[PDB]
């Protein structure tokens, strides 16, 4: 029933299957790293990410006269076995918390079904996998075997609090925006969280508040998983499409812009900043992309490799994109089914909706100002549970989000840095 069938321990011996040393397609050289397969198509690498971007392999913090506003550095974080063990257990716990909700179950199912499209072939008469959507697993005999995957959760790079989805690009194809999709690497940590303010006028002001309430890490991970979903189905909105914030004087006086992809991901009233016209533009654009995938599948006559049959892969993508198959067997995109899937991925899976399911306090809008970063430990059940997060039932922390109240539940939070006034 659980999303993760086995409760891995970082020190569990490698078996070359779900506990193995692996290498990722970063187009460069790297020493193998120990990774854990927690679910079909999903892996966790308890290491700081110095791999997806070779130009970001330095965890060392620059001089004090260089650190910006919202950022936190600690080159030693996640360098020991105990930390990696706790990281693995923390990430797994959050996946279970997310999966325990109907919305999270729906999102994770979509993610697992969202296999990156096999569009690496040079000939249109054959389908071939794109190698950067795979990892190389060291087998018991020391040989490497290529395994396709959809998602990898990895530790943050130098800036510990800069969580984000990273994926390998293609020489020509924009995999996260052409309907194809690509393996997503989420830089994330379950060992820290952020403080926000309960009053909207305070939370959206850069000069007020110390961060009384703590964001539930499950929401933060869910936010990244939503981005991952968009990217796996190749419908992420180009980052150059932004909202020139004009609803917050502090954002405005700095000409700050926020991408539509982020507003869409948060959802709620934020998603309304993307007008109907531009929204319809994107819908049509991605509809056309799904059409091309349907046609590319029809042009295929043979498959490259022996991992699976051509008909099998045609079926996995028929299910991913919910395509229709006529009498002749040709695939086509049905407008109704497309709109439903597109809407599910963009309107149903949103941060705002997850807050409703988790019943937690959270920022009311993406257009606010961070307050602080806290060190936390969600592994012990006495601190955080799959079912209630920090707001433990039948305790003084059960009501009024008392568990997220860092002043009441102070034993669960250590403020590492204050951001207010530093913008």
């Amino acid at each position: 029933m659980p999303f993760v069938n086995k409760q891995f321990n970082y020190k569990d011996p490698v078996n070359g299957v779900d506990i193995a040393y692996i290498k990722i397609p970063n187009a460069g050289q790297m020493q193998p790293v120990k990774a854990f397969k927690i679910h079909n198509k999903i892996w966790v690498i308890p290491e700081r990410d110095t791999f997806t971007n070779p130009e970001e392999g330095d965890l060392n913090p620059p001089p004090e006269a260089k650190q910006v506003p919202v950022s936190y550095y600690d080159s030693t974080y996640l360098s020991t076995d105990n930390e990696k063990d706790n990281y693995l257990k923390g990430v797994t716990k959050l996946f279970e918390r997310i999966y325990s909700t109907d919305l999270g179950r729906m999102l994770l199912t979509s993610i697992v079904r969202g296999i990156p499209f096999w569009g690496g072939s040079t000939i249109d008469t054959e389908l071939k996998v794109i190698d950067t959507n795979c990892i190389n697993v060291i087998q018991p005999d020391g040989s490497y075997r290529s395994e396709e995957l959809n998602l990898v959760i990895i530790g943050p790079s130098a800036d510990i609090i800069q969580f984000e989805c990273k994926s390998f690009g293609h020489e020509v194809l924009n995999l996260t925006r052409n309907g194809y999709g690509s393996t997503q690497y989420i830089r994330f940590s379950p060992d820290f969280t952020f403080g926000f303010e309960e009053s909207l006028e305070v939370d959206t002001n850069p000069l007020l508040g110390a961060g009384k309430f703590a964001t539930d890490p499950a929401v933060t991970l869910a936010h990244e998983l939503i981005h991952a979903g968009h990217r796996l189905y190749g419908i992420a909105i180009n980052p150059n499409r932004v909202f020139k914030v004009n609803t917050n004087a502090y954002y405005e006086m700095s000409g700050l812009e926020v991408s539509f992809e982020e507003l869409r991901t948060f959802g709620g009233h934020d998603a309304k900043f993307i007008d109907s016209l531009q929204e319809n533009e994107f819908r049509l654009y991605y509809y056309n992309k799904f059409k091309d995938i349907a046609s590319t599948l029809n042009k295929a006559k043979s498959i490259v490799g022996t991992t699976a049959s051509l008909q099998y892969m045609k079926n996995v993508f028929k299910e991913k994109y919910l395509l229709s198959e006529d009498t002749s067997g040709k695939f086509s995109v049905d407008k109704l089914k497309f709109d439903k899937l597109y809407k599910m991925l963009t309107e149903i899976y949103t941060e705002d909706n997850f807050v409703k399911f988790f019943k937690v306090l959270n920022r009311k809008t993406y257009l606010n100002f961070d307050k602080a970063v806290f060190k936390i430990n969600i592994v012990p059940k006495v601190n955080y549970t799959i079912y209630d997060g920090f707001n433990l039932r039948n305790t003084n922390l059960a009501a009024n989000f008392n568990g997220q109240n860092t002043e009441i539940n102070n034993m669960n939070f250590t403020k590492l840095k204050n951001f207010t006034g530093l913008f």
Binding site: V70, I161, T220, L256, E262
Partner: peptide, 4 residues
């Protein structure tokens, strides 16, 4: 991304 969390944003600012």
């Amino acid at each position: 991304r969390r944003g600012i």
